Amino acid sequence: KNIQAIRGMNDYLPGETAIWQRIEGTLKNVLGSYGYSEIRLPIVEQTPLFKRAIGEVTDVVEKEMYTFEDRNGDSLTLRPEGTAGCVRAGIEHGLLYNQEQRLWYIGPMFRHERPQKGRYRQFHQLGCEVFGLQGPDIDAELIMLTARWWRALGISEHVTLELNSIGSLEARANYRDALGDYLDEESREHFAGLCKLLESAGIAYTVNQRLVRGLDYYNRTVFEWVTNTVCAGGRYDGLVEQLGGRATPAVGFAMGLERLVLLVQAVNPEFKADPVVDIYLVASGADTQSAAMALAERLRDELPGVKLMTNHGGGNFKKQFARADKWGARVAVVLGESEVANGTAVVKDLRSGEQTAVAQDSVAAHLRTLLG
């Protein structure tokens, strides 16, 4: 009998997916308005990668990764994040040697934590990474980018930014005794210069020294966007080197798409996506089959952009209209034996009930006016 989805791994069913589609689109759209490019990386990578780049002491590598041994005996790990993955493909394809790269990625991520409301074992991130820029200016842009999404999505009133700086090794290996006190000048310099750009931008922030990231590749800048946390990231200038490439500056962040989606469904409880169906093609009688399907393609060639589902497996009219209704069809094009003969097809506005027989070469324009 029945197999169940592994615990901590979800099935975004149709209805859910429509919402995701809309949000993902807005996000991607904004990412494009800023000049960024999409990059795609593998789901699995050699375990050393997350051992090295993320650390051996991290709760992630220690007790959270999905590692297994390939048939050839190599330790493999299901990516718990993509920053490591990116740098890796970055160094390997030589796109970071004295080059600027503003990239983004979207896809699943894996970690064996325990299932919560906002925590899942296969979860999804939308992340950004930039290589080649040092100054706090670029750090500002990223935050501004996230800022624009909140606006775009309508959740600015429910997302707070929290900053912080952590200089480097010395700033810590000297701050052993016991608040970013040490932090050499260029660090309070770079953080101050970023805290300023952030103001001139009217972006409301809240510094906090008790803000730590569970990943050990961050240096200077470090932030988290929290809800009344959906996004987080920071700098990592030495990582490109610490993995075998010519050291170059870099900053990035990644957002939890399940958190973002749930938040967007909380703040705008009405947020709806387009129906999956605009036009339902009703048909009855014997041998209306090829006709209905032919009419369907025809209207498809004439109306790309409209969603038209063709009814199959018969059913009486009452049913077909119920089905058209089930999908959110705003209009139904009826093709019976008559219509077939008359070269017409009835066009019923499901909204207003009014129907009307139309010359086939005419329905396209008719529908165009109905669907407005």
Ligand X SMILES: Nc1ncnc2c1ncn2[C@@H]1O[C@H](COS(=O)(=O)NC(=O)[C@@H](N)Cc2cnc[nH]2)[C@@H](O)[C@H]1O
Which residues of the shown chain bind ligand X in the complex (CB under 6 A)? 81-83, 111, 113, 118-120, 123, 125, 127, 129, 214-215, 229-234, 236, 252-256, 258-259
Which partner from the list ligand X, a copy of itself, none does 243 bind, CB cut-off 5 to 8 Å by kind? a copy of itself
Choose among 287, 262, 281: nearest CA to 117. 262
Quote the tokens at residue 327: 């999908």
Which partner from the list ligand X, a copy of itself, none does 167 bind, CB cut-off 5 to 8 Å by kind? none
Which partner from the list ligand X, a copy of itself, none does 6 bind, CB cut-off 5 to 8 Å by kind? a copy of itself
Quote the tokens at residue 62: 């220690």
Within positions 264 to 293, which residues make up the interface with a copy of itself, using CB under 8 A? 276-278, 280, 289-290, 293
Report the nearest approach of ligand X to the CB of residue 115 (Å): 9
In angstroms and rounded to an integer, the radius of gyration of the C-alpha atoms of the chain is 27
Is the CB of 164 or the CB of 288 nearer to ligand X? 164
Cα separation, 331 vs 347, whole angstroms:
7
Backbone angles phi, psi at 71, to 5 degrees: -60, -25
Q: If you ran DSSP here, which 8-state letter would residue 158 be given? A: G
3-state secondary structure of 245: coil
| Interface stretch with a copy of itself, choices 102-110, 172-180, 183-191, 217-225 (CB under 8 A) | 102-110
Is the CB of 211 or the CB of 321 nearer to a copy of itself? 321
| Residue 43 binds a copy of itself, judged by CB under 8 A | yes
| Residue 81 binds a copy of itself, judged by CB under 8 A | no
Cα separation, 364 vs 370, whole angstroms:
10
Q: Where does 129-178 have alpha helices with state H?
A: 137-153, 170-173
Is the CB of 254 or the CB of 299 nearer to ligand X? 254
Report the nearest approach of a copy of itself to the CB of residue 72 (Å): 9
| Residue 368 binds a copy of itself, judged by CB under 8 A | no
Residue 150: CA atoms inside 13 Å, Cβ hemisphere, count?
21
Which partner from the list a copy of itself, ligand X, none does 196 bind, CB cut-off 5 to 8 Å by kind? a copy of itself
Which partner from the list a copy of itself, ligand X, none does 73 bind, CB cut-off 5 to 8 Å by kind? none
Q: What is the C-alpha end-to-end distance of the chain, expressed in Å?
A: 49
Cα separation, 279 vs 371, whole angstroms:
9
Which partner from the list a copy of itself, ligand X, none does 81 bind, CB cut-off 5 to 8 Å by kind? ligand X
CB neighbour burial string for 185-196, b if at least 16 within 10 angstroms, e if fewer:
eebeebbebbbe
| Residue 106 binds a copy of itself, judged by CB under 8 A | no
| Interface stretch with a copy of itself, choices 72-80, 160-168, 169-177, 331-339 (CB under 8 A) | 72-80
Pick one of 148, 220, 235, 330: the residue that binds a copy of itself (CB under 8 A): 148
Choose among 61, 30, 275: nearest CA to 128. 30
